[PDB]
């Protein structure tokens, strides 16, 4: 009961330090991405310490399992190098007992990760989306440049104005090409709403509010002779910020209570994804105890980068399987539990390698 | 001092080559995994593999300084942990001579880096990007994300793909009249540059007289185009500013300066590509200071971990200070000089402390 | 009265053969030394007895109970202790906690039994005056005494010391020899391997010389120092 | 020549390790540096070598004062050094091992370097292993090649660090033979080691350092009869 709270203190302290460093690095990378986007002109520099503040729970929920993995590796490597566990084993301590000692901090980490996954990351993502969409820090239409075109997604929508003025009114021409990605063969969905005057307005009720002062709308695809001419005024079209919708979807912000009774495959796949991040905690706890056996020649730091690569592969495989799930291909009965079982089996292979070798040698003689 | 120089140089060179190989392999694997997301019918597995393998020299040239730093750390720590540098110092060989011995291969390495980044990386990068665009872009008038848009007097052109040898794909022209009516909307499969002539082969224009009549689709077999789009300029705009050669970057910076646009994004690329030797020299100097100081007895894994962490921090700072120069008001030169400057300062400090 | 018998041990690293048919035997209350040239199979034999190296041939049994295939904790539960060469004290645990962390795992002791055992181990080894200092603030002698008391806390039948007279002052070997004599008086079959031939042969009442992976000699100090083969391959002709 | 360390001192964090230790190694003299492990003996050895910056005192090699010169400056002044661990150039052959240091010497030309290499190979009986890589050498051959390489730089004093460390009683004869061969050349060997008996045997004068102070000096007989030494370091039962 003394070794228990000795190992559980070492592991927790090392995990805290590693998690802090990893969080700093990940936040820095996301900040370089958002700063480059703001440099391009599609963001408000003032609204940058809330975008990063509302994304911390997701980074923490993705980092804490890796923090525990590396903390277990470092702490138990230190104990192995200092001849401190050879005297625990030479007095009676098993390796299943070591696993049982290690599974106590893993429970606290799993509880923290489960809370972050099921009740705090959805709220943070919801608030982040609320800000970036509703509060319209500055829309892309407030960054127009005369003579230069502007596009979105796969060039599906290209907005351009010939004249740019401080009053933002009576613009020479609004060349907008709102194209449907799929609208069947006969109609390509590509339409041009060009007006003699640019009617930029308050843009408050429906986010970016845009209407044509005079109106000249054509739905005729250039390939065929079918021309759809609407020379009347074009009705108000509501433009959302592509950045907010591109990275954050509705599935990442719905409350967890709405996923239990849902039938939409996306919601069920998201629920299965949420109840997995606590599970990597136990999986990597089982994967880490056998791997932390080191020699003074190897040291603690030799197998940290391979562990990071293994964890990243785990996460990538989980994300890919979730995509194949909510796309309707993989049946929802099996889910991501087969990936979880694959990595659990890898961990069990690592754990029982030495007992298997000893039992094989015993029967050989 | 010939045998010692060759010994140290060979060790450092081999370590740097191995580290560069491993880093490039990891980068290529990550790039392929990311590119798998945009798989499609027109863009197959073979096309993605070809693009990934064709953008190898660009990644190698970009990641050369990190390979130099980590390889110098590993190779010099191999000698330091074996007490083979204490013997050199106790035989009368100073620290400056060891630094120069390590630095001699670095000159040839950075010369090769400059040569590749000016002659080989732009060529293969242009070949690769053009290919991905041709594959992912032959569908229709507005299909690809890698397209280009331009404005004439009243015409509006959208080129789906821009290929090196003055040939475009999916050229679409909208010719509005004075009353903003669609006088003619056309789509052409290909084009060819012949001085002032652009030949829009396979052009199917759909002109419309707005005097209450139907649009007449006309199948012209070949059309002349009075385009003011020079292919040499076209290849530059569709390419990232960091994927251009040093000479091409210089020419485009001056061309942008003449008209009056903002070339501060291209000055950063010019400084990054030109001042690379100084950055690698500062990184290897700090690695040498690390070996002679804190890490003269630690194991190989700790040296690799420290090198990776320092490289990550250096790249994060470099990428943070790039857009910061454009959003704020300070020259882009300080976005390249500062990190290498403090790295050299720390290396000199730790070397002076012996 | 126990007996730790190693019979026909053999081990082959790479394709070469390091150890070849080395047979040992340590009784209870007996001090045995395992000496030999550095390149020979002395350390390999010691580790194969300890459990850190798996013997290819041969068996290791204590009182008609094969422990050759058991892991290190299996041997430890069978009654075979082990004390590593370097410092192996719990750095952040007090001296009393060092012994109590091992006393708490004994299934034949209750709370009162653990209390009395800790008191006895503290008084017997004269470490009671430092029963609250952290293990990282102990000198060499106190550290060694605390390590030996911690090893005894698990009640072993045999203790295998690995280089006890390693990097210690001539005054410090007196404390180590006193501790070893105390262990022999308690009834524990110590086995020592060391580079220091003089003090090992002084303290040990029986020695085994292993050269070229074979047992080339056996006997007390007088028989070892009067052997032509040992004086030829190990000690030279000018030893003492 | 004569190497003098005077009034040496060195204080680590907070505490003091070495306080006013003074030695003197002549030419053709074998001198030991013994004492308890904790005391400032290794620190004094390293401060003489040049691996630790002395806070006070002066290290003078003959007339020159080299207390401020770095390790390579001291080595150019004529102070050798042989580390305890293996320090042979692993990927270089034995002849290349000696030659890589012979090329450093500036007073030798090509023919002189060749003749010196041949003499060094013949003198230490390594002429039959001159084409073996440094990583494929046994302990005795490796130590002989290391000593030859140390001599290749033409030093005046060689400061051996733990020569009799973890070696068989057979090999101490070879080590003593090499040390006496070096002394016969005119080199002021200085040995610090844990092995008290062997060091007191081979040496001619000993320096005991306890609690950062020189508590005894002189030949082996006077060292073994000293009461203070017999009470702090050796013990009353030591021979
Ligand atoms: C600003 C940028 C972030 C901060 C930069 C790093 C500052 C702190 C790093 C200190 C490193 C010190 C070191 O190397 O020693 C390991 C340390 C102490 O060990 P020591 O006492 O040397 O043992 C002998 O042992 C420890 O306890 C180490 C704890 C520190 C955290 C370890 C590193 C974890 C993060 C590694 C990231 C690598 C890249 C991964 C990227 C993908 C992420 C998904
Ligand atoms: C010593 C260090 C030890 C470190 C060990 C580390 C081990 C890590 C192991 C985990 C690896 C995780 C790899 C994740 C792969 C993700 C693949 C993916 O996202 O594929 C999806 C892609 C999309 O295609 P789809 O949506 O079907 O589109 C149809 C078009 N109409 O679907 C496809 O079309 C994909 C078809 C297959 C293509 C090949 C996939 C290559 C991945 C190789 C990974 C190898 C990693 C190293 C082992
Ligand atoms: C279209 C182009 C496509 C390019 C794709 C390239 C993909 C490469 C990915 C695989 C590379 C893995 C290599 C990892 C090897 C690590 C293993 C190791 O320890 O190697 C050590 C090895 C020993 O060398 P040895 O001969 O023993 O040296 C002593 C001799 N005096 O040391 C070695 O010398 C072996 C390692 C050599 C690695 C060479 C590869 C890196 C250099 C190329 C960089 C990329 C540049 C491409 C374009 C260049 C144009 C000029
Ligand atoms: C923002 C922080 C980024 C940090 C990145 C990761 C850094 C890891 C550093 C690991 C190496 C140091 C390990 C220290 C172990 C404990 C100290 C020790 O034992 O060494 C002794 C040494 C004194 O010896 P001496 O070298 O003579 O001075 O004691 C020392 O003096 C130790 C000195 C350590 C100096 C570390 C310098 C790091 C420089 C990072 C440059 C990043 C550049 C990119 C960012 C630019 C931002 C503008």
Coordinates of N, CA, C and O in Angstrom, one line a residue, chain D residues 97-220:
Chain D
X97 N 45.3 4.9 -35.7 CA 45.0 5.5 -34.3 C 46.2 6.3 -33.9 O 46.1 7.4 -33.4
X98 N 47.4 5.8 -34.0 CA 48.6 6.5 -33.7 C 48.9 7.7 -34.6 O 49.3 8.8 -34.2
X99 N 48.6 7.5 -35.9 CA 49.0 8.5 -36.9 C 48.1 9.7 -36.9 O 48.5 10.8 -37.2
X100 N 46.8 9.5 -36.5 CA 45.9 10.6 -36.4 C 46.3 11.6 -35.4 O 46.0 12.8 -35.4
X101 N 47.1 11.2 -34.3 CA 47.6 12.1 -33.3 C 49.0 12.5 -33.7 O 49.4 13.7 -33.4
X102 N 49.8 11.7 -34.4 CA 51.1 12.1 -34.8 C 51.1 13.2 -35.8 O 52.0 14.1 -35.9
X103 N 50.0 13.2 -36.7 CA 49.9 14.3 -37.6 C 49.6 15.7 -37.0 O 49.9 16.7 -37.6
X104 N 49.1 15.6 -35.7 CA 48.9 16.9 -35.0 C 50.2 17.6 -34.7 O 50.3 18.8 -34.8
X105 N 51.2 16.9 -34.3 CA 52.5 17.4 -33.9 C 53.1 18.3 -35.1 O 53.2 17.8 -36.2
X106 N 53.5 19.5 -34.8 CA 53.9 20.4 -35.8 C 55.5 20.4 -36.0 O 55.9 20.9 -37.0
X107 N 56.2 19.8 -35.0 CA 57.7 19.7 -35.2 C 58.1 18.6 -36.0 O 59.3 18.4 -36.2
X108 N 57.2 17.7 -36.5 CA 57.6 16.6 -37.3 C 57.2 16.7 -38.7 O 56.1 17.3 -39.0
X109 N 58.0 16.3 -39.6 CA 57.7 16.3 -41.1 C 57.3 14.9 -41.4 O 57.1 14.0 -40.6
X110 N 57.1 14.6 -42.7 CA 56.5 13.4 -43.2 C 57.4 12.2 -42.8 O 57.0 11.2 -42.3
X111 N 58.7 12.3 -43.1 CA 59.6 11.2 -42.8 C 59.8 11.0 -41.3 O 59.8 9.9 -40.8
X112 N 59.8 12.1 -40.6 CA 59.8 12.1 -39.1 C 58.6 11.4 -38.6 O 58.7 10.6 -37.6
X113 N 57.4 11.7 -39.1 CA 56.2 11.1 -38.7 C 56.2 9.6 -38.9 O 55.8 8.8 -38.1
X114 N 56.7 9.2 -40.1 CA 56.7 7.8 -40.4 C 57.7 7.0 -39.5 O 57.4 6.0 -39.0
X115 N 58.9 7.6 -39.2 CA 59.8 7.0 -38.4 C 59.3 6.9 -36.9 O 59.5 5.9 -36.2
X116 N 58.6 8.0 -36.5 CA 58.0 7.9 -35.1 C 57.0 6.9 -35.0 O 56.9 6.2 -34.0
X117 N 56.1 6.8 -36.0 CA 55.1 5.8 -36.0 C 55.7 4.4 -36.0 O 55.2 3.5 -35.2
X118 N 56.7 4.1 -36.8 CA 57.3 2.8 -36.8 C 58.0 2.5 -35.4 O 57.8 1.4 -34.9
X119 N 58.6 3.5 -34.8 CA 59.2 3.3 -33.5 C 58.2 3.0 -32.4 O 58.4 2.2 -31.6
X120 N 57.1 3.8 -32.5 CA 56.0 3.6 -31.5 C 55.4 2.2 -31.6 O 55.0 1.6 -30.6
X121 N 55.2 1.7 -32.9 CA 54.6 0.4 -33.1 C 55.5 -0.7 -32.6 O 55.1 -1.7 -32.0
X122 N 56.8 -0.6 -32.9 CA 57.8 -1.6 -32.5 C 58.0 -1.6 -31.0 O 58.2 -2.6 -30.4
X123 N 58.0 -0.4 -30.4 CA 58.3 -0.3 -29.0 C 57.3 -0.9 -28.0 O 57.7 -1.4 -27.0
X124 N 56.0 -0.7 -28.3 CA 54.9 -1.2 -27.5 C 54.4 -2.6 -27.9 O 53.4 -3.0 -27.4
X125 N 55.1 -3.3 -28.8 CA 54.7 -4.6 -29.3 C 53.3 -4.7 -29.8 O 52.5 -5.6 -29.4
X126 N 52.9 -3.7 -30.7 CA 51.7 -3.7 -31.4 C 51.9 -3.7 -32.9 O 50.9 -3.4 -33.6
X127 N 53.1 -4.1 -33.3 CA 53.4 -4.1 -34.8 C 52.7 -5.2 -35.5 O 52.6 -5.2 -36.7
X128 N 52.2 -6.2 -34.8 CA 51.5 -7.4 -35.4 C 50.0 -7.2 -35.4 O 49.3 -8.1 -35.9
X129 N 49.4 -6.1 -34.9 CA 48.0 -5.9 -34.8 C 47.7 -4.5 -35.4 O 46.7 -3.9 -35.1
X130 N 48.6 -4.0 -36.3 CA 48.6 -2.6 -36.8 C 47.4 -2.4 -37.8 O 47.2 -1.3 -38.2
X131 N 46.8 -3.5 -38.2 CA 45.7 -3.4 -39.2 C 44.4 -3.8 -38.7 O 43.4 -4.1 -39.5
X132 N 44.2 -3.9 -37.4 CA 42.9 -4.2 -36.7 C 42.2 -3.0 -36.3 O 42.8 -2.0 -35.8
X133 N 40.9 -3.0 -36.6 CA 40.1 -1.9 -36.2 C 40.0 -1.7 -34.6 O 40.2 -2.7 -33.9
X134 N 39.9 -0.5 -34.2 CA 40.0 -0.2 -32.8 C 38.9 -0.9 -31.9 O 39.1 -1.0 -30.7
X135 N 37.8 -1.2 -32.5 CA 36.7 -1.8 -31.8 C 36.9 -3.3 -31.6 O 36.1 -3.9 -30.9
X136 N 37.9 -3.9 -32.3 CA 38.1 -5.4 -32.2 C 39.3 -5.7 -31.5 O 40.0 -6.7 -31.8
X137 N 39.7 -5.0 -30.4 CA 40.9 -5.2 -29.6 C 40.5 -5.7 -28.2 O 39.5 -5.2 -27.6
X138 N 41.3 -6.6 -27.7 CA 41.1 -7.0 -26.3 C 41.6 -6.0 -25.3 O 42.1 -4.9 -25.7
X139 N 41.4 -6.2 -24.0 CA 41.7 -5.2 -23.0 C 43.2 -4.8 -23.0 O 43.5 -3.6 -23.0
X140 N 44.0 -5.8 -23.0 CA 45.5 -5.5 -22.9 C 46.0 -4.8 -24.1 O 46.7 -3.8 -24.1
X141 N 45.6 -5.3 -25.3 CA 46.0 -4.6 -26.6 C 45.4 -3.2 -26.7 O 46.1 -2.3 -27.1
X142 N 44.2 -3.1 -26.3 CA 43.5 -1.7 -26.3 C 44.3 -0.8 -25.4 O 44.5 0.4 -25.8
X143 N 44.6 -1.2 -24.2 CA 45.3 -0.3 -23.3 C 46.7 0.0 -23.8 O 47.2 1.2 -23.7
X144 N 47.4 -1.0 -24.4 CA 48.7 -0.7 -25.0 C 48.6 0.3 -26.1 O 49.5 1.2 -26.2
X145 N 47.6 0.2 -27.0 CA 47.4 1.1 -28.1 C 47.1 2.5 -27.5 O 47.5 3.5 -28.1
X146 N 46.3 2.6 -26.5 CA 45.9 3.8 -25.9 C 47.1 4.5 -25.3 O 47.3 5.8 -25.5
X147 N 48.0 3.8 -24.7 CA 49.2 4.4 -24.1 C 50.2 4.9 -25.2 O 50.8 5.9 -25.2
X148 N 50.3 4.1 -26.3 CA 51.1 4.5 -27.5 C 50.5 5.8 -28.1 O 51.3 6.7 -28.4
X149 N 49.2 5.9 -28.2 CA 48.6 7.1 -28.7 C 48.8 8.3 -27.8 O 49.1 9.4 -28.3
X150 N 48.8 8.1 -26.5 CA 49.1 9.1 -25.6 C 50.5 9.6 -25.7 O 50.8 10.8 -25.7
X151 N 51.4 8.7 -25.9 CA 52.8 9.0 -26.1 C 53.1 9.7 -27.4 O 54.0 10.5 -27.6
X152 N 52.2 9.4 -28.4 CA 52.4 10.0 -29.8 C 52.4 11.5 -29.8 O 52.9 12.1 -30.7
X153 N 51.8 12.2 -28.8 CA 51.7 13.6 -28.7 C 52.9 14.2 -28.0 O 52.9 15.4 -27.8
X154 N 53.8 13.4 -27.5 CA 55.0 13.8 -26.8 C 54.7 14.7 -25.6 O 55.0 15.9 -25.6
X155 N 54.2 14.1 -24.6 CA 53.9 14.8 -23.3 C 55.1 14.7 -22.4 O 56.0 13.9 -22.5
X156 N 55.0 15.6 -21.4 CA 56.0 15.6 -20.3 C 55.4 14.9 -19.0 O 56.2 14.2 -18.3
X157 N 54.1 14.9 -18.8 CA 53.5 14.3 -17.7 C 52.2 13.6 -18.2 O 51.5 14.1 -19.0
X158 N 52.0 12.4 -17.7 CA 50.8 11.6 -18.0 C 50.0 11.4 -16.7 O 50.6 10.8 -15.8
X159 N 48.8 11.8 -16.7 CA 47.9 11.7 -15.6 C 46.9 10.5 -15.8 O 45.8 10.7 -16.4
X160 N 47.3 9.3 -15.3 CA 46.4 8.2 -15.5 C 45.3 8.2 -14.5 O 45.5 8.5 -13.3
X161 N 44.1 7.9 -15.0 CA 42.9 7.9 -14.2 C 42.4 6.5 -14.0 O 41.9 5.9 -15.0
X162 N 42.6 5.9 -12.8 CA 42.2 4.6 -12.5 C 42.7 3.5 -13.4 O 42.0 2.9 -14.2
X163 N 44.0 3.3 -13.4 CA 44.6 2.2 -14.3 C 44.2 0.8 -13.9 O 43.8 0.0 -14.7
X164 N 44.2 0.5 -12.6 CA 43.9 -0.8 -12.1 C 42.4 -0.9 -11.7 O 42.0 -1.2 -10.6
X165 N 41.5 -0.5 -12.6 CA 40.1 -0.5 -12.4 C 39.4 -1.7 -13.1 O 39.4 -1.8 -14.3
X166 N 39.0 -2.7 -12.3 CA 38.3 -3.9 -12.8 C 39.1 -4.7 -13.7 O 38.7 -5.2 -14.7
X167 N 40.4 -5.0 -13.3 CA 41.3 -5.8 -14.1 C 41.7 -7.0 -13.2 O 41.8 -6.9 -12.0
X168 N 42.1 -8.1 -13.9 CA 42.5 -9.3 -13.2 C 43.9 -9.1 -12.5 O 44.6 -8.2 -12.9
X169 N 44.2 -9.9 -11.5 CA 45.5 -9.8 -11.0 C 46.6 -10.1 -12.0 O 47.8 -9.8 -11.7
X170 N 46.3 -10.8 -13.1 CA 47.3 -11.0 -14.1 C 47.7 -9.7 -14.8 O 48.9 -9.4 -15.1
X171 N 46.7 -8.9 -15.1 CA 46.9 -7.7 -16.0 C 47.6 -6.5 -15.2 O 48.1 -5.6 -15.8
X172 N 47.5 -6.6 -13.9 CA 48.2 -5.5 -13.1 C 49.7 -5.5 -13.3 O 50.4 -4.5 -13.3
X173 N 50.3 -6.7 -13.6 CA 51.7 -6.8 -13.9 C 52.0 -6.1 -15.2 O 53.0 -5.3 -15.2
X174 N 51.2 -6.3 -16.2 CA 51.4 -5.6 -17.5 C 51.2 -4.1 -17.3 O 52.0 -3.3 -17.8
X175 N 50.2 -3.6 -16.5 CA 50.0 -2.2 -16.3 C 51.2 -1.6 -15.6 O 51.7 -0.5 -15.9
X176 N 51.7 -2.3 -14.5 CA 52.9 -1.8 -13.8 C 54.1 -1.7 -14.7 O 54.9 -0.8 -14.7
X177 N 54.3 -2.8 -15.6 CA 55.4 -2.8 -16.5 C 55.3 -1.6 -17.5 O 56.3 -0.9 -17.7
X178 N 54.1 -1.3 -18.0 CA 54.0 -0.1 -18.9 C 54.3 1.2 -18.1 O 54.9 2.1 -18.7
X179 N 53.8 1.3 -16.9 CA 54.0 2.5 -16.1 C 55.5 2.7 -15.9 O 56.1 3.8 -16.0
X180 N 56.2 1.6 -15.5 CA 57.7 1.7 -15.3 C 58.4 2.0 -16.6 O 59.4 2.7 -16.5
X181 N 58.0 1.5 -17.7 CA 58.6 1.8 -19.0 C 58.4 3.3 -19.3 O 59.3 3.9 -19.8
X182 N 57.2 3.8 -19.0 CA 57.0 5.3 -19.2 C 57.9 6.1 -18.3 O 58.5 7.1 -18.7
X183 N 58.1 5.7 -17.0 CA 58.9 6.4 -16.1 C 60.4 6.4 -16.5 O 61.1 7.3 -16.4
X184 N 60.8 5.2 -17.1 CA 62.2 5.1 -17.6 C 62.5 6.1 -18.7 O 63.6 6.4 -19.0
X185 N 61.4 6.5 -19.4 CA 61.6 7.5 -20.5 C 61.8 8.9 -20.0 O 62.5 9.7 -20.6
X186 N 61.3 9.2 -18.8 CA 61.4 10.6 -18.2 C 60.1 11.3 -18.1 O 60.0 12.5 -18.3
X187 N 59.0 10.6 -17.8 CA 57.7 11.1 -17.8 C 57.2 11.1 -16.3 O 57.4 10.1 -15.6
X188 N 56.6 12.1 -15.9 CA 56.1 12.3 -14.5 C 54.7 11.7 -14.3 O 53.7 12.5 -14.2
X189 N 54.5 10.4 -14.2 CA 53.2 9.8 -14.1 C 52.6 10.2 -12.8 O 53.2 10.4 -11.8
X190 N 51.2 10.4 -12.8 CA 50.4 10.6 -11.6 C 49.2 9.7 -11.7 O 48.5 9.7 -12.7
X191 N 49.0 8.9 -10.7 CA 47.9 7.9 -10.6 C 47.0 8.2 -9.5 O 47.4 8.5 -8.4
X192 N 45.7 8.2 -9.8 CA 44.6 8.2 -8.8 C 43.8 7.0 -9.0 O 43.4 6.7 -10.1
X193 N 43.6 6.2 -7.9 CA 42.9 4.9 -8.0 C 42.3 4.5 -6.7 O 42.7 5.0 -5.7
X194 N 41.3 3.6 -6.8 CA 40.7 3.0 -5.6 C 41.6 1.9 -5.0 O 41.6 1.7 -3.8
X195 N 42.4 1.3 -5.9 CA 43.2 0.1 -5.4 C 44.4 0.7 -4.6 O 45.4 1.2 -5.2
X196 N 44.3 0.7 -3.3 CA 45.3 1.3 -2.4 C 46.6 0.5 -2.5 O 47.7 1.1 -2.5
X197 N 46.5 -0.9 -2.4 CA 47.7 -1.7 -2.4 C 48.5 -1.5 -3.6 O 49.7 -1.3 -3.6
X198 N 47.9 -1.6 -4.8 CA 48.6 -1.5 -6.1 C 49.2 -0.1 -6.3 O 50.4 0.0 -6.7
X199 N 48.4 0.9 -6.0 CA 48.9 2.3 -6.1 C 50.1 2.5 -5.2 O 51.1 3.1 -5.6
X200 N 50.0 2.1 -3.9 CA 51.1 2.3 -3.0 C 52.3 1.4 -3.3 O 53.4 1.8 -3.0
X201 N 52.1 0.3 -4.1 CA 53.2 -0.5 -4.5 C 54.0 0.2 -5.7 O 55.2 0.5 -5.6
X202 N 53.3 0.5 -6.8 CA 54.0 1.0 -7.9 C 54.5 2.4 -7.7 O 55.6 2.8 -8.2
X203 N 53.8 3.3 -6.9 CA 54.2 4.7 -6.8 C 55.5 4.8 -6.0 O 56.0 3.9 -5.4
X204 N 56.0 6.0 -6.0 CA 57.2 6.4 -5.2 C 56.8 7.4 -4.1 O 57.5 7.3 -3.1
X205 N 55.9 8.2 -4.3 CA 55.4 9.2 -3.3 C 53.8 9.2 -3.4 O 53.3 9.0 -4.5
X206 N 53.2 9.4 -2.3 CA 51.7 9.4 -2.3 C 51.2 10.6 -1.6 O 51.9 11.2 -0.8
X207 N 50.0 11.1 -2.1 CA 49.4 12.2 -1.5 C 48.0 11.8 -1.1 O 47.1 11.5 -1.9
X208 N 47.7 11.8 0.2 CA 46.4 11.5 0.8 C 45.6 12.8 0.9 O 46.1 13.7 1.5
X209 N 44.4 12.8 0.4 CA 43.5 14.0 0.5 C 42.2 13.6 1.1 O 41.5 12.7 0.6
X210 N 42.0 14.1 2.3 CA 40.7 13.9 3.0 C 40.1 15.2 3.5 O 40.9 16.1 4.0
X211 N 38.8 15.4 3.3 CA 38.1 16.6 3.6 C 38.7 17.8 2.9 O 38.7 18.9 3.5
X212 N 39.2 17.6 1.7 CA 39.7 18.7 0.9 C 41.1 19.2 1.4 O 41.5 20.3 1.0
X213 N 41.8 18.4 2.2 CA 43.1 18.9 2.7 C 44.1 17.7 2.6 O 43.7 16.5 2.6
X214 N 45.4 18.1 2.4 CA 46.4 17.1 2.3 C 46.8 16.7 3.7 O 47.4 17.4 4.5
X215 N 46.4 15.5 4.1 CA 46.7 15.0 5.5 C 47.9 14.2 5.6 O 48.4 14.0 6.8
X216 N 48.5 13.7 4.5 CA 49.8 13.0 4.6 C 50.4 12.9 3.2 O 49.8 13.1 2.2
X217 N 51.8 12.7 3.2 CA 52.5 12.6 2.0 C 53.8 11.9 2.3 O 54.2 11.8 3.5
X218 N 54.4 11.3 1.3 CA 55.6 10.5 1.5 C 55.5 9.1 0.9 O 54.5 8.8 0.3
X219 N 56.6 8.3 1.1 CA 56.6 7.0 0.5 C 55.6 6.1 1.2 O 54.9 6.5 2.1
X220 N 55.5 4.9 0.7 CA 54.5 3.9 1.1 C 54.6 3.6 2.6 O 53.6 3.5 3.3

